[PDB]
Design a binder for this molecule. Sequence first.
Ligand SMILES: *[C@@H]1O[C@H](CO)[C@@H](O[C@@H]2O[C@H](CO)[C@@H](O)[C@H](O)[C@H]2NC(C)=O)[C@H](O)[C@H]1NC(C)=O
Ligand SMILES: *[C@@H]1O[C@H](CO)[C@@H](O[C@@H]2O[C@H](CO)[C@@H](O)[C@H](O)[C@H]2NC(C)=O)[C@H](O)[C@H]1NC(C)=O
Ligand SMILES: *[C@@H]1O[C@H](CO)[C@@H](O[C@@H]2O[C@H](CO)[C@@H](O)[C@H](O)[C@H]2NC(C)=O)[C@H](O)[C@H]1NC(C)=O
Ligand SMILES: *[C@@H]1O[C@H](CO)[C@@H](O[C@@H]2O[C@H](CO)[C@@H](O)[C@H](O)[C@H]2NC(C)=O)[C@H](O)[C@H]1NC(C)=O
Ligand SMILES: *[C@@H]1O[C@H](CO)[C@@H](O[C@@H]2O[C@H](CO)[C@@H](O)[C@H](O)[C@H]2NC(C)=O)[C@H](O)[C@H]1NC(C)=O
Ligand code: NAG
Lengths: 595, 98
Amino acid sequence: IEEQAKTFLDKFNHEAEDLFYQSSLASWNYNTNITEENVQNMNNAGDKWSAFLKEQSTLAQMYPLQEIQNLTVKLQLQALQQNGSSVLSEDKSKRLNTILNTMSTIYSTGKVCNPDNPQECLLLEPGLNEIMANSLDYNERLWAWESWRSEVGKQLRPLYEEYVVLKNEMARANHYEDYGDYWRGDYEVNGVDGYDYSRGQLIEDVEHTFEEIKPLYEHLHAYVRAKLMNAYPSYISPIGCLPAHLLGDMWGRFWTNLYSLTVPFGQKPNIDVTDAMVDQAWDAQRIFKEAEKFFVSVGLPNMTQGFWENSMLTDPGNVQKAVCHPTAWDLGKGDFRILMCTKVTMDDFLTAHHEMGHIQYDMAYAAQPFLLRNGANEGFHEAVGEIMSLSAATPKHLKSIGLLSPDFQEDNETEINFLLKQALTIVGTLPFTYMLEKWRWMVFKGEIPKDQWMKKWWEMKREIVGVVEPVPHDETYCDPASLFHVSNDYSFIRYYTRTLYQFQFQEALCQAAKHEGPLHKCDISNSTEAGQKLFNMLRLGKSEPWTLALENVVGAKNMNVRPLLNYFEPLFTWLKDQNKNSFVGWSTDWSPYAD
Amino acid sequence: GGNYNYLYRLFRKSNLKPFERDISTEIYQAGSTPCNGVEGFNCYFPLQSYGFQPTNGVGYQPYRVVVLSFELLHAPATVCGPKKSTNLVKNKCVNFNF
Ligand SMILES: *[C@@H]1O[C@H](CO)[C@@H](O[C@@H]2O[C@H](CO)[C@@H](O)[C@H](O)[C@H]2NC(C)=O)[C@H](O)[C@H]1NC(C)=O
Ligand SMILES: *[C@@H]1O[C@H](CO)[C@@H](O[C@@H]2O[C@H](CO)[C@@H](O)[C@H](O)[C@H]2NC(C)=O)[C@H](O)[C@H]1NC(C)=O
Ligand SMILES: *[C@@H]1O[C@H](CO)[C@@H](O[C@@H]2O[C@H](CO)[C@@H](O)[C@H](O)[C@H]2NC(C)=O)[C@H](O)[C@H]1NC(C)=O
Ligand SMILES: *[C@@H]1O[C@H](CO)[C@@H](O[C@@H]2O[C@H](CO)[C@@H](O)[C@H](O)[C@H]2NC(C)=O)[C@H](O)[C@H]1NC(C)=O
Ligand SMILES: *[C@@H]1O[C@H](CO)[C@@H](O[C@@H]2O[C@H](CO)[C@@H](O)[C@H](O)[C@H]2NC(C)=O)[C@H](O)[C@H]1NC(C)=O
Ligand SMILES: *[C@@H]1O[C@H](CO)[C@@H](O)[C@H](O)[C@H]1NC(C)=O
């Protein structure tokens, strides 16, 4: 009966909040002060949380799921009843964890040695990522691109084939058709009177939104190709694809390292307020106190006053071994801490606004039950953090926060320099993200057999992304598995939808703050009505369907690409005038070796 | 490490009458199945403990409460405020209260 499930969850909601607390408090003491008497302090305290949750999970199947009427207590029950693994045979369950540990340690400890000196050998993160991000030598970028895929990616090919079979068995025992349908279960919504969403409906909404970005991406692809021919003459065709090893990093995920070759007006400095911070003696604490004044300006609460003692805003005065990585912690019981090692720079002035945005999202849904204290889907949590960073990087906000000469002149040449640096990171990553999840979805359902994995991968690079390989690759390579998110078992569609939600939030908040100009000049400071539009979504958590959360801000029930294109229309107008003598589009027949 | 000595009751058959008190420790029975003094599904111990810890956000830290309740049965009198004493004088026509 349904009233027994309510009494089940309230014993759960008070044993979990304490056991999650000290399992996360011990993870704080390891992260900010590393010993090994802290790693053993967090492994036993971490396993008491994991052993407790599988005990309550096997108690949750005593209650049926379709004999429930209240939507909230049904949502908590389905998130706890989830079997996930453990549906496999107990010798297949240990084979899967052996593969996931072997693929993870090949990626982090794989070395590449030089053919002129076999005694010097580079790892990926120090040394191989620096070549792909800084070099202008064609022959050295071609060496680092091919040798990472032929010496490390060939080890992951027999391991990734066994990984697909075991993950499809686990997904079909949980009544999905494949493992790709298991990943799309985040966006599913069942029976809330007009707000429903199918797991197959996500596939059409991604492909419908993508064919409206292809006019903008084609003009960006044509402008970068014309600028790369001056940097690498006799290597690039003026009507063809771009070679895969000249894109700024190892995989071509972000084009953000191509800015020094593709800058529109290099005689205008892109605005940088780092010298005005060290001329006014701003400490470590000023960067957060101006960040807290931004959020109280819009109508959001202060920091919790436990935030100021418990947090560790710099690396300590001790030479203290403590993972230095910006992050926002939500230990529980209303205890919010930020861990970062901040330097006096406009870079960490902006990520301070980003990391505080995770805190203000966390402080808002802290009145829901324990199992609904996440973002409404996997994409909302990063998207609310980046609309705080866009509004703080504007020169309108910088001159009113005291950091820009009240006699500063923004010209139309510097807005093109700023918008093109945004499009190399935002627009340049959208066909990469769409192509990769489309390839992984077709591998799991079996539309691509294993004798055509690397054949269909490079046909989709030339057609969707416009990127050609420099050396042909047969079915002994596995080039997707040489990325971190593929070999470490992570979903990748959250980076596509976060980019679309980010400009839907920003365009909906700037109509409430009564903006008049272009969308990229907007700032939501001093408003109250925009914050009330934002706070009505922030407090929902997972208690409502995410389509119901979007109408509280945007006014629509689906993700939309038209606010993303309105941000880049000053660039799209300027790009169509720079490509009057160029060719827009590419040919899938040209190759850098096929002459 | 958590002060686990401060408990509260989280299951009862029926809400309390005003100023009523209940220190029993019988195993609660949520479902219809009888409990027979042992724990299990739908048979819960009725007391939980605040695990208080010094690094808790406000609203999670312990507050001490005192409830004063003045009652007036039908006696002849009892405790009350304190009476003040105004300075004294004399030899002058005055308005007095003794
Ligand atoms: C890292 O934290 C641990 C524990 O928080 C520190 O180790 C001991 O902590 C106790 C407190 O319970 C002290 O009485 C001991 O003196 C600490 N050990 C030592 C060797 O000092 C540890 O000190 C912290 N790390 C550093 C570098 O201070
Ligand atoms: C079941 O649904 C009802 C409404 O559909 C929820 O009722 C609300 O409960 C809160 C506190 O529990 C009250 O403050 C509200 O006034 C109630 N609303 C109404 C309309 O009466 C109820 O909370 C849900 N059950 C659970 C366990 O959350
Ligand atoms: C979870 O996996 C189990 C198999 O281990 C599935 O079958 C359940 O088996 C248990 C006994 O171990 C029964 O109590 C359940 O009734 C069975 N399933 C149900 C509730 O029909 C079970 O179907 C899986 N649960 C999910 C999430 O589908
Ligand atoms: C920035 O604004 C100036 C001012 O309008 C633009 O200069 C004009 O450019 C057009 C097209 O080349 C000419 O027909 C006008 O005669 C120019 N104006 C003047 C006063 O000379 C300039 O092109 C703009 N730059 C960008 C990048 O948009
Ligand atoms: C936006 O908010 C800021 C912060 O309160 C306002 O800045 C104040 O501006 C006045 C006059 O411009 C100064 O006298 C104050 O010293 C400023 N306050 C601070 C804390 O620096 C700003 O005026 C607001 N914008 C509008 C349009 O009202
Ligand atoms: C936030 O804190 C400041 C001082 O730190 C205070 O003046 C302000 O009133 C606080 N905000 C609210 C809503 O009380």
